[PDB]
Structures are given as structure tokens and as C-alpha cells.
């Protein structure tokens, strides 16, 4: 009606980024998810550009941490007292679950902890792991703990950054038992309930399943479950945030098109609250052409019947 | 008449990503560039969406490598035989300087080298550094070397990834002497000329300088020069690539606007070949409101005289 036309990006899946970890998308996946709660906090955005949960705009400020560190005596463990992106003091009273970009799964995330000494520009970097299921993982309260490879190299009161790389598993344990991508951390610790969460999502329509945007997280030790599914590519979050096109119905019908044939491969529902469903029953890795893309076709209701995927 | 209208993203500087390394933008910087050649290969795209140099679309597939590795006896060094993003064979004959996303500066980039064994899903990760100025750095040929913290953990003929984190310097030598952000690597090795390059850029009007989109790379050891300037944010590259709006003239005039006050702070030229200039003389860190953004106003040409910044 003159309303700003809704669109999705024309970037292909492999040209886009996982919204839950700073790695490329690899593929589309669908499977049943009735048995458990799907309530990721990263990669959550309405089609009209309202960021939800812990979602922020940067594809490379996901699962990062910044602040000051203090050594835990008799250990190679450091407590990081969190700062903001701009390196200011952290504010815990904001009505968010945790700082934006905080990890939204229970797992042992490995990367590098790096630091610069302001006075002379000296620098240092150490392999480090943050276990988001641990008692000291209290990002909402302004603190997390890292296990590192040093007992003395990090300085106090100097800007320190964690850059995530991948995940680990304890190899004396049954394989692929962690990370648990669908388990939220307890952002304030084990005795305090999470707050201000983006809602859980599920298909409601018979024969429908969620369509996931899937990556494989690098594994850094042990026998981890490396699958990582997001609801929206990070580029879609950035696109909707900018466009802010109002939803004209509950569902934006998308067609996934193959340029090499000119034909539609499948269609799907992009729910205005920011998730996708397809008509399929079972676990399936979608096979798509490298140049295939999503195209918005029309606003439909929640109860539209999709052609089977 | 009838050209698709040109636009730039409304994302703020701080909401965008460096196109030369997987870190957020921090600030805008201008300075004289007569003392160097500004010929980065990442973050190069025309306003009409033609990717140049080694530029690709993923903000998280910049300064990464994938392939499989071979140990060099007597050392902690491994040679990686490069694969593509989707783990396929690398083609050295494609008319590009190097694989898309290859580092475009001489420096020592530190990160983690990770691996998965296909048969059992066992994984491993080690701190690793790639010396992009060294003789073994031959990405165009399909081979690069990493120095690591292990002499025996990595397996042969298993998919291996390098994830970049930051840069290092040798602390026994002159501080901030490396990395050298404006020195291109020799993509095929010592004394072999590079091919298929994106061109050097410079201001071509009196009283103009390049406008750079600047970040600070993490430092991981020693006393590195952490400054990193790109010509275009990664989001701008993604935007132009998708939009493909025809360049109506040589220069798109942009205004940088403060929505808090409603006033234009400065104007600048976005050259159709994908770089920005401003009217200023001297090194200057721009001070901008966090909410400030760029807006396309009109097509002009290279003879247009800017208002002083
Ligand atoms: C499954 C196994 O995981 C990794 O080994 C770790 C051990 O890691 C430590 O030793 C290994 C070399 O043996 C390596 O140097 C690693 O960086 C270092 O932390 C250790 O954490 C044990 C303790 O539970 O778990 C695993 O065995 C990996 O390095 C191995 O190659 C292999 O994939
Ligand atoms: O100068 C101290 C420094 O020496 C080097 C090591 O890699 C660091 O862990 C640190 O101990
Ligand atoms: O000369 C090498 C030396 O460089 C710095 O001093 C580092 O802190 C040390 O860990 C060591 O690597
Ligand atoms: C210059 C040195 O570089 C290395 C670091 O491990 C040290 O902390 C120091 O910064």
C-alpha cells in the first residue's frame, strides 16, 4: 500500500555468516525440534528490524569478551571483569539477558586472550577457554572466568580481549556430548533465573519444521559436537535492522531460486518474529546450488500451506 | 535516466566491520599518503558491485586458511596445502592475485590452527603464526607455512583451519616496525610479481586526502603496529555487490550526517572504483557522533570541490 517493500538479501548461504558464532554458513538443515526448547538469544531479530535477546549487529563481536583480568592464585585461571565494546564500565541494569553477543549455548569455547599495555604498547596472547556452563560464568553480573596457558603473563588493569575460535569436549567422556547448542547458559549463575529472553520458537503448522542456517564450529580438543544452527544469518539481522520494513502479515513467503535453471527449488515461511519454517518431516541436509538465493514473494498468513520441501 | 538508485548502508561506523581483518571498525582517519602506496586487496569493490583484488563477501573468511598440513621435521612448522572455503581443491589459475580473503599486508598474524580427524571426530588446536613476508608464504601457489606450538599433534590428510586473531612483532627490534599494512605480500613468493591486482589509490585533487575506515588489531606478542585501515567497510562491499547500482558519474557525493542535531558534519567523495576522499590536510582522527551515518546525495565528478572537512 506504499509500505516499504520487504526484502531479504540476495547473498547466497556461503556468502553469509552464522549469527551465533563468527564463522561462515555452510548449509541449510531441517529437523524435528519438538522434544526440546529452541531459544537462542543471538541471531534474533524481527523482520521489521527489532533486535531481540542478546543480538547485536557485528558478525565479529559474537562470543567475544572484553575487560580487565585478575589472576586466580594457584591456578592458570583468570577472572575477567567485563567492560563494554567501547571499553567503558559494564552496566548490569539494562533490560537484556546478558551483554549483547554473549554466548547463547553451554559449551567450552576456546580462543585467544590478548592484551595490550597502554604505556608501552607491549602485547601478549594466550590460548584460553571459557566454560559457559561453569559456576563462574556470570556475564550478566559482569564477570566470567578463563582457563589459560599462563600463571603470570597477564597484567592487571589493562584492556584484554577474548577472540573465540571453536569448541572443546572432555575426551574421557562420551563423544559429542558437549557443547549443547540448545541449552542456554545461566547468565547470572546457577541460582538466578535468566531474564529478558527472546522467546522460544517452534513450528505450529502441521508438517512443518524449522529451517536452520548451519555451520560447523572448529573443534580444538576432544570429541565435540560442532554443529551450530542459527535462525537467521547475521546479514539478515543487519538487513532488517536497516530496512525496517513493516510486516504486512504474520509470514513472509520466500522462494529459494536456482539461477542455473530459473526454477524455484523450495519455498518457506519467514515468520515476522524472525525464524523460518519448511514443510518437511525428518532430518535433512538440504542440497542447494552455490548460486541459489532466497527471494521474498508475498505476505501470507501463518496458516498457508507450503509445497513440500 | 533509469539507473537503479545508488545508496550506502545506514549503519554507523561503529556498527560495521573492517574489510581487511575480522574486527569491528572503530573510527575514521585521514592522513597524507604520499609516503606509501595504498593498494590493499581486501575491501575492494566498485560502487556498482564488482569485487576487486582478493575481495570476497564474508566478514569471517578474511585472513583465514583451510587445507591440510605436513610437518616440517626439526621444527614446529607445518606447511598447509590450501583448499577452498567449502573444502574443495584450490585452483591456482583463477585470475585473482591469491585466494579470496588472503591477507593483503606483510606481517605476522597469530591465531589458532585447528583440525578434525574425519574417522572419529577427534579434534585439536594450537597457537600458530603465519609470516606473510616470508619466503614460504605462497598462497597463490597453494601453499603457506605456519609456525605452531607443536611438533607432533597435527595429522596429515585431515581438514585443518587457521583462524586469525591478531598480530605480533619481534620485541628485540624497533617498536611498531611491523606489521606493514601498506606492503603487499608476494603472493607467489620471493621476487615473483603479483597478478590481477586491484589498483593503487590516491587523492587526485588539491587539498584532498584518503578517508580510511580504521581498526586496531589485537596484538599477541611484542610491540606491533596495530593500526589497520580499509577503504570500504565490509558491509559496504556486501551492499554494493547486491545492489549493483550503476555509477552515473565518477564520484558519488556523500554527506555524513548527525541525526542528533540534524546537521551535516562533512561531505566526501566516494569514487566509483571504491574509495573515499575528503578535503583535509594533515593526520586527523575524526571525531564523530556515535549515531552519525553516511548518506548518498548526488552524482558529481572528479572536478567537484568539497567543502573543507
Ligand atoms: C582427542 C584428543 O584431544 C586433544 O588432546 C587433548 C589433550 O590436550 C593436550 O595435549 C594434546 C597433545 O596430546 C595437545 O597438546 C593439546 O593442545 C593439549 O591441551 C588433553 O587436553 C586431554 C586431557 O583430557 O584431552 C585431550 O586428549 C588433541 O590435542 C589430540 O590430538 C586428540 O584429538
Ligand atoms: O617475556 C615473557 C613471555 O615469554 C614468552 C612467552 O611466550 C610468554 O608466555 C611470556 O612468558
Ligand atoms: O623473542 C620471543 C619473545 O617475544 C616476546 O618477548 C614474548 O613475550 C615472549 O613470549 C617470546 O616469544
Ligand atoms: C613484549 C613481550 O611480548 C611477549 C609477551 O608474552 C610479554 O608479556 C611481553 O609483552
Task: Name the grid cell of B174.
Answer: 624497533
Exposure string of A262-280, with b = 16+ CB inside 10 Å and e = fewer, is eeebbbbbbbbbbbbbbbb
* Cβ contact B221–A11 (<8 Å): no
Tell me how the structure was determined. X-ray
Phi and psi of A122, rounded to 5°? -65, 150
* Cβ contact A221–B85 (<8 Å): no
Q: What does the radius of gyration of chain B's CA atoms come to, in whole angstroms?
A: 21
Question: Would you call B7 helix, strand, or coil by DSSP?
Answer: coil
Q: Which of residues 247-286 of A touch B (CB under 8 A)?
A: none
Question: Would you call B234 helix, strand, or coil by DSSP?
Answer: helix
Set of chain A residues whose Cβ sits within 8 Å of the Cβ of B25: none
Which residues lie below 8 Å from residue B283, measured CB to CB, with a gap of 6+? Answer: B29, B30, B31, B32
Measure B225 CA to nearest chain A CA, in Å.
9
Distance A152 CA to ligand 2 centre (A): 9
Q: CB contact, 8 Å: A125 with chain B?
A: yes
Which single residue is written with the C-alpha cell 585501515? B229
Choose the mutation target among B49, B174, B220, B230 for the interface with A, i.e. most A CBs under 10 Å. Answer: B220
Q: CB contact, 8 Å: A235 with chain B?
A: yes
Phi and psi of A8, rounded to 5°? -110, 155
- Dihedral (Cα; A135, A136, A140, A142), 10-degree rounding: 170
- Dihedral (Cα; B153, B107, A25, A298), 10-degree rounding: 180
SS (H, E, C) B30-84: EECCCCCCECCCCCCECCCCCECCCCCCCCCCCCCEEEEEEECCCCCEEEEEEEC
Domains of chain B, each with CATH number or no CATH: 1-61+175-309 (2.40.510.10), 62-174 (2.40.30.120)
Q: CB contact, 8 Å: B57 with chain A?
A: yes
Sign, CA dihedral A50-A56-A59-A63, equals negative
Strands (E) located in A85-179 = 108-116, 123-131, 143-148, 160-168
Beta bridge partners of B45: B51
* Least distant ligand from the CA of B150: 1
Question: Would you call A139 helix, strand, or coil by DSSP?
Answer: helix
Q: Which of residues 209-228 of B touch A (CB under 8 A)?
A: 218-224, 226
Q: CB contact, 8 Å: B238 with chain A?
A: yes
Beta bridge partners of A296: A254
DSSP code at position A17: B
Choose the mutation target among A43, A55, A60, A226 for the interface with B, i.e. most B CBs under 10 Å. Answer: A60
Task: Name the grid cell of B133.
Answer: 613476508
Q: What does the radius of gyration of chain A's CA atoms come to, in whole angstroms?
A: 21
Which residues lie below 8 Å from residue A261, measured CB to CB, with a gap of 6+? Answer: none
Task: Name the grid cell of B301.
Answer: 565528478
* Cβ contact B85–A14 (<8 Å): yes
The residue to mutate among B69, B76, B113, B124, having the most atoms of ligand 1 within 8 angstroms of its beta carbon, is B124
Set of chain A residues whose Cβ sits within 8 Å of the Cβ of B163: 165-166, 218
* Cβ contact A169–B222 (<8 Å): no
Set of chain B residues whose Cβ sits within 8 Å of the Cβ of A9: 238, 242
Distance A161 CA to ligand 1 centre (A): 24
Chain breaks in chain A (C to N over 2.5 A) after: none
The H or E element containing residue B237 is helix B234-243
Phi and psi of B296, rounded to 5°? -70, 130
Distance A150 CA to ligand 2 centre (A): 9
Q: CB contact, 8 Å: B244 with chain A?
A: no
- What resolution in angstroms, rounded to 1 decimal? 1.2
Measure A25 CA to nearest chain B CA, in Å.
10
Amino acid at each position: 500500500t506504499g509500505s516499504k517493500p520487504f526484502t531479504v538479501p540476495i547473498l547466497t548461504v556461503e556468502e553469509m555468516t552464522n549469527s551465533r558464532f563468527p564463522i561462515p554458513l555452510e548449509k541449510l538443515f531441517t529437523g524435528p525440534s519438538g522434544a526440546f526448547v529452541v531459544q537462542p538469544q543471538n541471531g534474533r531479530c524481527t523482520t521489521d528490524g527489532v533486535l531481540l535477546g542478546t543480538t547485536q549487529l557485528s558478525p565479529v563481536n559474537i562470543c567475544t569478551f572484553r575487560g580487565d583480568v585478575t589472576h586466580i592464585a594457584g591456578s592458570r585461571n583468570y577472572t575477567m571483569n567485563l567492560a563494554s565494546l567501547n571499553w567503558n564500565n559494564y552496566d548490569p541494569t539494562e533490560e537484556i539477558p546478558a551483554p549483547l553477543g554473549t554466548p547463547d549455548f553451554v559449551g567450552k569455547i576456546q580462543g585467544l586472550l590478548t592484551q595490550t599495555t597502554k604505556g608501552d604498547g607491549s602485547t601478549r596472547g594466550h590460548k584460553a577457554t571459557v566454560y559457559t556452563g561453569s559456576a563462574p560464568f556470570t556475564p550478566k553480573l559482569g564477570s566470567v572466568q578463563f582457563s589459560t596457558d599462563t600463571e603470570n603473563d597477564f597484567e592487571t588493569h589493562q584492556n584484554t580481549k577474548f577472540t573465540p575460535v571453536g569448541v572443546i569436549q572432555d575426551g574421557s567422556t562420551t563423544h559429542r556430548n558437549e557443547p549443547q547448542q540448545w541449552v542456554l547458559p545461566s547468565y547470572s549463575g546457577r541460582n538466578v533465573h535468566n531474564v529478558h529472553l527472546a522467546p522460544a520458537v517452534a513450528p505450529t503448522f502441521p508438517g512443518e519444521q524449522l529451517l536452520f542456517f548451519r555451520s560447523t564450529m572448529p573443534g580444538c580438543s576432544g570429541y565435540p559436537n560442532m554443529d551450530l544452527d542459527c535462525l537467521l544469518p547475521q546479514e539478515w539481522v543487519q538487513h532488517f535492522y536497516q530496512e525496517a520494513a513493516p510486516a504486512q502479515s504474520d509470514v513472509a513467503l520466500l522462494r529459494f531460486v536456482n539461477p542455473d535453471t530459473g526454477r524455484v527449488l523450495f519455498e518457506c515461511k519467514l515468520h515476522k518474529s524472525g525464524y523460518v519454517t519448511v514443510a518437511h518431516t525428518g532430518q535433512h541436509d538440504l542440497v542447494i546450488p552455490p548460486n541459489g538465493y532466497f527471494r521474498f514473494d508475498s505476505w501470507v498468513n501463518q496458516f498457508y500451506t507450503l509445497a513440500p520441501m
